[PDB]
């Protein structure tokens, strides 16, 4: 969960992986791995194991070894490191690898969520709300917005 060890990971992920294009390919392999630790017996059995060799062994082995050899010999790398203990850190950091690479997004304020990928501000944003259509903001629609301006307002009711 340090994710910094996994930072060096996701580093080597875009790096060797995307270099191998395993950023996607071991996005697949990686996916299967988080599936492996996701196995709770494989969690229940996660660490009793002194030999990390035993771990990568029963790991690729158990799970079905969808990891690359970059991830099998890397399975020696992190498994041996035992930093393999934390799967998702560099998984969301790899999601941050390809995704950060691809980043365009949005966040709905005073609205039900948006997340419309906007490479630029207001780019897909004003295009979305303008594009609304939706325009309802349903989650945060009214009480949230009207309590936003009226939030500032009660903030004036600070005068009491």
């Amino acid at each position: 969960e340090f994710i910094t060890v996994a930072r060096p990971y996701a580093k080597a992920a875009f790096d060797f992986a995307v270099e191998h294009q395993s950023v996607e390919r071991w996005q697949d392999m990686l996916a299967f791995a988080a599936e492996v630790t996701k196995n709770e017996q494989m969690a229940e059995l996660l660490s009793g194991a002194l030999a990390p060799e035993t771990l990568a062994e029963s790991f690729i082995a158990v799970a079905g070894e969808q990891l690359d050899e970059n991830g099998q010999n890397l399975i020696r790398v992190m498994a041996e490191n035992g930093r393999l203990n934390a799967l998702p850190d560099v998984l969301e950091q790899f999601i941050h690898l390809r995704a950060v690479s691809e980043a365009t997004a949005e966040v709905d304020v005073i609205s039900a969520a948006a997340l419309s990928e906007q490479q630029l501000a207001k780019i897909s944003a004003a295009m979305e709300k303008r594009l609304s259509r939706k325009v309802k903001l349903n989650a945060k629609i009214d009480k949230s917005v009207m309590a936003g301006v009226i939030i500032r307002a009660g903030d004036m009711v600070i005068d009491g």
Binding site: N39, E40, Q41, A43, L45, G48, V62, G64
Partner: protein, 74 residues
């Protein structure tokens, strides 16, 4: 295995590739890791803390306190 809970299905058949593994003992278990008679404790996980426990060859191994994973004991 594949996608939902198949991930856990043939992670139980991928497990079950390996599935001989996951298990634990209470008490039973073992003294996980030790030097000089204080031990990380393996197995025996959930137990009354400080239950003097029939100890090697003899003693009632005095359960020190729950360090949840591997209890230390006297």
């Amino acid at each position: 295995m594949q996608l939902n809970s198949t991930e856990i299905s043939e992670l139980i058949k991928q497990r079950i590739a390996q599935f001989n593994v996951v298990s634990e003992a209470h008490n039973e278990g073992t003294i996980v890791s030790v030097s000089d008679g204080v031990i990380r404790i393996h197995g025996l996980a959930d137990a009354m803390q400080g239950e003097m426990i029939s100890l090697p060859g003899n003693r009632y191994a005095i359960a020190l306190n729950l360090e949840r994973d591997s209890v230390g004991a006297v």
